[PDB]
Amino acid sequence: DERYARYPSLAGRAVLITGGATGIGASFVEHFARQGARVAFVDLDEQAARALAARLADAAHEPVFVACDLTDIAALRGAIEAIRARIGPIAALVNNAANDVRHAIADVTPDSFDACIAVNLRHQFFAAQAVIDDMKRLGGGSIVNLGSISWMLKNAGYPVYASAKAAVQGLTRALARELGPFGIRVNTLVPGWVMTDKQLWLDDAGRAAIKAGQCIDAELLPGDLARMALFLAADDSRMITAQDVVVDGGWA
Amino acid sequence: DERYARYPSLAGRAVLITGGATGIGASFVEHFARQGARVAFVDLDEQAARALAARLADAAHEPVFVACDLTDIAALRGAIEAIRARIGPIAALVNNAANDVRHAIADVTPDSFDACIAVNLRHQFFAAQAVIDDMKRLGGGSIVNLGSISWMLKNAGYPVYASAKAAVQGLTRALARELGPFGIRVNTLVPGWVMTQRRLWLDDAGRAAIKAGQCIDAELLPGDLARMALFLAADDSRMITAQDVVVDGGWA
Amino acid sequence: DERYARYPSLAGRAVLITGGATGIGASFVEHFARQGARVAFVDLDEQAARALAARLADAAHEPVFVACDLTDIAALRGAIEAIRARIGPIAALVNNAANDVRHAIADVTPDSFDACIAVNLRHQFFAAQAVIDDMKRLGGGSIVNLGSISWMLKNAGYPVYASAKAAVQGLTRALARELGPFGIRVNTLVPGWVMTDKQLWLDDAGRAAIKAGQCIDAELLPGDLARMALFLAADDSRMITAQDVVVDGGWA
Amino acid sequence: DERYARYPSLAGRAVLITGGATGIGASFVEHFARQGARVAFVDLDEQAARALAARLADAAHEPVFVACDLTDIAALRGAIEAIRARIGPIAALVNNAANDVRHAIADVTPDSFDACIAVNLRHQFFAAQAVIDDMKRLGGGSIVNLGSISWMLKNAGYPVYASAKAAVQGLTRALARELGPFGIRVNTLVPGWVMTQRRLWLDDAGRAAIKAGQCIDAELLPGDLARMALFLAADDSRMITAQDVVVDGGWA
């Protein structure tokens, strides 16, 4: 859309997005590709991944995909290595992959707790760990960790997810301190209730909750999040680090 | 600088900046003018205002201004009315004017308290009040209120300034709730220690404090803040409202 | 009530409460009096003040009252002087007086803005200013500034009140830094929606909002706030300073 | 110390503390025991646990304990069941056990990540899970989760610990929402730099950092935290839930 910004510093920039095949992940892939970045992404959904790359084949750089289960850290490290060979040293990382499946407090088991941490928090740390050397060599970079307003609203229904997403604050801040001396910014990008393909299907009370919660009476869309990530990855935000950057219509 | 973003939605957009003639105010005026906006500003200092407009006369629109004292709400309102006559309805307001002069707790008088509130907080409210109808007519807009990390760091030296700048949170949030039904966003933009003053001129302890405080060991510049204001005023940030948008190298 | 704490350090302690005649102010007066403190309070409502002192005449110390309009700083300073003569150097100050009268954005005038700041924020600063020397002489003390969840929830209906109450954060933090070297703690005490005599009179939507907002489905009462203030004024909280101490059932 | 509060509601109250044998854990055990509570604790170190109970055998109730490894959720659950047999239904839980061992970003492995989450966050969830039914039966209760200012200060040196301690916010808030309908409060208790280590033993720079950070130039002690936990577990704090209750001298 011609109304929105063009970021010269993203042209040719190596950008890695996790969980990139669907949802806001796919919006990140599309937006970066349309800015001329050299995008790569990982996901489990190979069919969706191929579709996304195909509809972006007319970008400056067709996005690169590697299938990966991000609960498997060895696999993730291998995928990042394979990606670096194709797009070069990673300059921006969007730690997006998540799973907000509901779970009752009483039903949580040690294994289900661990799985929730694995699919929401743990890979953010290990993906960051794997790109630091690249960013040092580049003279800086930007790591964008996906958070959530879930815990900020004190939502019921998924206590380990709320915990995992609040954890991102600590991850972001700790990494920002250690990586800032190398020009690496680390920020948490916090979506509100994003209307995706998966998310008029609510009941009246759900619509009322969004309208009462948000200050702005409009649907939050993937592109709202993606444009914020563009700015955070671009040179334009070089002194923004350790922030909780909330894009939510004013709810939380 | 050709590395930074261009925002097509700012071309021709009417933007009003308070305290525009010096400091970060002048950086906001210049950045908006260079994006092609129709900029107006107010400032106490007619000479500084004249100089700023003159050196931006080669922009798409030469910035216009009214010299006045915004502790005088009648004068502020008259200035905004005169500006609206010259640039049309206001689409973005940057509520920037401030005065951080130091004051000891014991030296504060009722008059000096009131003056500090007048020059730091009060005009933000009244400038906003004066542009709401324009933004409602336009179908949206963006109000950017300047905050400060002073109170976040619990700085000594200016307790009424710390109070006035913390107050901006409440102003922002209250306005965001009432104005959001019309597509008007209201955010607080929070600078760190901006080198308008510079690190080199400090003593060893002063330099050390900034280096220890910030995550990134680089000088924060007016342009870091101005680029964030561009994004907040542009269509790109349509669902970002009620935020404390901190640009400070990771200090606060 | 015999179930609640007894604070030995409050016995005989000089405690000043502003706006003490009604509402949570009166609850502070009662609670401190029942702990054996030497209480004084200021208020405009002389009838209510006399009633409150009369029903507490059987405490260790009958509370002392001085009528005062806290928009008049000279009067406030005079009242504090008169109070010090009766209860001794002030060891704890509860900056409680407030007025949350609703006001439309469009209806705010320079005078009404100023009056809202005067009756909500300004006297907190000046009462603090007037007790610092006492607390230095005592070797420490505790200043408790009343805040509000209004601005935290981004409530509509009173933008200058929201601003004034957010300002308390800056006041508290700035004072905490400067006064901490003298053992003076400064904290913001933040009530939720307190059910007072003034506040089953809501409509169904109002009750639903409180039940949806609070985590705990019970009425917040003055005593919930008053017990927190006891702890903050007592020796028990000697290392708690610069906090936003929220007592609200989990809403904000 | 006769200067501090006595909480009548803690007499006979069943209180469970994790990591009870050392550090602030032992201070919690002692303070609750001296208030007349029926204390139980778990700890890895059977010898330290035995010593602690022995030196508190003159309390109204000698503390009881189970030595176990709370990275083993089966063992934790078995311990809590054995404790409930000995002290009755649990009315207050202090989720204290932690390990802040330093770790370089590059040295973190999947195993070491998981172990850090296990010893800092995971057991908080499972201990809470194990006491909910008791608190529902009792008609209320208090769960106090230990946080940290580490991540608030953006400390380097232990990124997974910072992550795990930030996660506690989400755990607290999520549990507070679901448990509040039963009168169960859930709060995060956040210590500063507690002198368990002491200022005198630091180098000049270390002392300076605490003096510059804290508003109050005094050593934070275990008792500062323990008294706050008493208040949070006592009836006195019945409407305080979902909070980050920071006891840190004004640093964070």
UniProtKB/TrEMBL annotation, chains B, D:
Q: Which Pfam families match?
A: adh_short_C2 (PF13561)
Q: Which InterPro entries match?
A: KR_dom (IPR057326), NAD(P)-bd_dom_sf (IPR036291), Sc_DH/Rdtase_CS (IPR020904), SDR_fam (IPR002347)
User: What PROSITE patterns does the database record attribute to this sequence?
Assistant: ADH_SHORT (PS00061)
Which parts of the sequence bind NADH? 22, 24, 43, 69-70, 96, 161, 165, 194
Q: Where is the Ketoreductase domain?
A: 13-193
Q: Which Gene3D superfamilies match?
A: NAD(P)-binding Rossmann-like Domain
Question: Which superkingdom is the protein from?
Answer: Bacteria
What keywords appear on the UniProt entry?
Nucleotide-binding, Oxidoreductase
Q: What are this entry's molecular-function GO terms?
A: nucleotide binding; oxidoreductase activity
PANTHER family, per this entry?
OXIDOREDUCTASE, SHORT-CHAIN DEHYDROGENASE/REDUCTASE FAMILY (AFU_ORTHOLOGUE AFUA_5G02870) (PTHR43639), SHORT-CHAIN DEHYDROGENASE_REDUCTASE FAMILY PROTEIN (PTHR43639:SF1)
Record family assignment: Belongs to the short-chain dehydrogenases/reductases (SDR) family.
Protein name, please?
A: Oxidoreductase, short chain dehydrogenase/reductase family
Q: Which organism is it from?
A: Burkholderia thailandensis (strain ATCC 700388 / DSM 13276 / CCUG 48851 / CIP 106301 / E264)
- Lineage of source species: Bacteria, Pseudomonadati, Pseudomonadota, Betaproteobacteria, Burkholderiales
